[PDB]
Amino acid sequence: GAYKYIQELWRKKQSDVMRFLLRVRCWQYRQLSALHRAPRPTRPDKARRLGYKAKQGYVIYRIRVRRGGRKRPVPKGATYGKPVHHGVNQLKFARSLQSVAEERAGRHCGALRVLNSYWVGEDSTYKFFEVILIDPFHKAIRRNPDTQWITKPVHKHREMRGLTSAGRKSRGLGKGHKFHHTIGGSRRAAWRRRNTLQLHRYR
């Protein structure tokens, strides 16, 4: 099939052809708006890996995220306290810019529901992400039993709770010795389960 050729063609990014394509696409997407609709995917293979199909009610938004770390929103210095917390410039935001892209697309569209998202281009000042959005209300999704879990009200705003992949990569969850701080439900559930007194009846 053609998809494996397209897959390793998108893998080999350092070549002349793909550097030319990333430069032209990143230029065009920088001239476009910060949030708009792509009527077709730029990476159809990567969209198919993430779960996009070619049917009605599957929408793709191309949005941009301004690139860089997160500085502390305070006046000039003036973090009133001990010298640990005077760091303002070199702070980093806990979630990734792809998850920032997902939550911005999901906040712009409360009706549409985020499936996942992928990278298409980056500038020094911006990154560019295609976010896959799904109707939970169109009949082609609603009558399909494979995707009707999207139509359930449990998956409302996955992009804010971190249920998509770019949010799950920021939660630090997993199995094994490297993920002890999120055993249980999450990191908060781990901390709450560890910091309780089990004061029994008969003790």
């Binding site: 309780t196 004061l199 029994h200 009846r201």
Partner: protein, 158 residues
Amino acid sequence: APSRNGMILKPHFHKDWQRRVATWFNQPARKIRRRKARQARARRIAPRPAAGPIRPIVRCPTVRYHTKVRAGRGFSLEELRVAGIHKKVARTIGISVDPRRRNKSTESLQANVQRLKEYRSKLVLFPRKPSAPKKGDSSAEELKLATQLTGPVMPIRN
């Protein structure tokens, strides 16, 4: 300010622990709730055992415990292939199946195959339609005598 003689101690009460105090007064009500849910499952599956499907003779890892024998997650695929039971038939006839397990030892392999051979003989399979029985079904004298087994089915004794 410590006195004359005593143990050094580190009380972990420097956080705000009084907000997160799990009181255990739900305990006898939860015992009643587990009891009612277990009796509800036992009344739901009427000929089937109240415990569940059978669980393998399992050696323990981690050299402190390897003399002891547990009841495991499920039977191995090589165990099912030697015993001659398909892995999708086994889940329907009440057999725990997991694909993650391996078979390094031959003795535990033969023991779980023998336990499958014993469970296939002890199993009383009811027909799908009562009016038209099939080839692989139990007899009408066993249809009346079949009943539940209280506790774990074939309890593994060390």
